[PDB]
């Protein structure tokens, strides 16, 4: 098992989808991990926020799998269990560092398992990308918080997106799991609220053979009238479904979600099959300081990561001197600046999370041990319950880069420990052949799309809507075998 | 102690064996090695049974109550590995 363990006065837990158990995640995982460690270094180098407290880290692979993430969550937990616990001469083995607070994120299912295992140890947990509405509940997940808004706000944004184009008749597909099911249920409720019908609902499983996805594709083609499919999937399932839909001679205008996000590697090599896609993302503002820090990184100056070598040899497809015969050997001048490095949108969220935790600790330090800037007897024992309930949940500090224009500088949690609901909408339009996303609008509660800048798939507004609003006042509506939508029959003038 | 927190600590005492094997002394590290529990009989007060069931769910260790009649434990979602020879409370 590969880990990161940097010791200090206090240590934060690190949960990321570094691997996909499979292959290394290139954007979601490693950029977020580097950002977290960068913020940790900034904390351990500054002088106004925990100056005398050196903040360490313990970061572990999740593989986007419940059982595996649970095993490294148990690795986090071992520290509190070993406290009550001998040896003939000296028994060290591994010394599990006492985690002050776990910055645990990635998908919703992993975060829910981590919250379940950490609630029993009253260890605070801050997420950065998990957005399931289930985690808003405090009955089972009281000690869970996150700087991202819950799922049902995103579902409401999706329903508004649908009703802006009058897409009354749409299909939808979600990933079989807690996140996909919960979010798609919320979005379907919003759709029935806005009188926006649905065609089909399909589930593919968090991990499945390439038999479910093509069946879902055939189901989506079983209703040609519905040119719009609402996709609410996790990132890996989105990748698999896009690959499957490209396998068949098919295309659509995919209404995507946060799991799709502004991700490029998900659609890698498959621009056409998802060209008119509409994707929502939790709006943010990237950090230039992290940009320069991350670009300054090299495998020679980065021994802090067990994966950075494999990350480099995957992203650039060139092997180091380890083998030198698989594909190629990296030149000595390889870099990141001009290369295809678009830092993930959800980086600053990650960073904010850590700082929130840091500030909480700072406030707790200013309360438990205000006489000195030390981890004295009052503070050397972590009061996770009190830390979470009195410092974490109530944290009101300006954004780390309020010098940059940010009306939403205040990181203010709701009563349930969630962030502001403020989203960006993207379409995968063409710019230069190797085209990418760019912002087509923003949303707080009222849409701000721009139809002109959409540049749709079939060079035209998708008319995924079914026949017409039947207007029974002049022609009544009937559903012979078409339960979804209606067909009009001109009512008699004498009836 | 008919308490959630104290029974939770002894539940940890149950649990602080699984993480031991996966975890190197100078000569030996063995004072009182806890044993992995094939199955836990834990019951009486409902809150205690719920907390112990939450802890055991993460370890697929079956837990059988003997008196906790709470219908909340009837929920097999978060109390999957739970069982009880006592009927639920709605009766
Ligand atoms: C969605 O449907 C509504 C009405 O059902 C459209 O609203 C009208 O559209 C006509 C042209 O089709 C305009 O002349 C009117 O100004 C609109 N009136 C009202 C009260 O809305 C709406 O345009 C449709 N949205 C899109 C993108 O086509
Ligand atoms: N909310 C998504 C994950 C978002 C992300 O990976 O950034 C699921 O769970
Ligand atoms: N079901 C009761 C306890 C039953 C008992 O103590 O015998 C409460 O909870």
UniProtKB/Swiss-Prot annotation, chain B:
For the ligand (L-glutamate), the binding residues are: 46, 67-69
* Cellular compartments annotated: Cell membrane
Q: In which tissues is it expressed?
A: Detected in brain cortex, thalamus, subthalamic nucleus, substantia nigra, hypothalamus, hippocampus, corpus callosum, caudate nucleus and amygdala.
Its domain of life reads: Eukaryota
Q: What does this protein do?
A: G-protein coupled receptor for glutamate. Ligand binding causes a conformation change that triggers signaling via guanine nucleotide-binding proteins (G proteins) and modulates the activity of down-stream effectors. Signaling inhibits adenylate cyclase activity.
Similarity comment text for this entry: Belongs to the G-protein coupled receptor 3 family.
Q: How does it assemble?
A: Interacts with TAMALIN.
State the name under which the record lists this protein. Answer: Metabotropic glutamate receptor 3
Which gene is annotated as encoding this protein in its UniProt record? Answer: GRM3
Q: Which residues of the full protein are shown?
A: 99 to 196 of 879
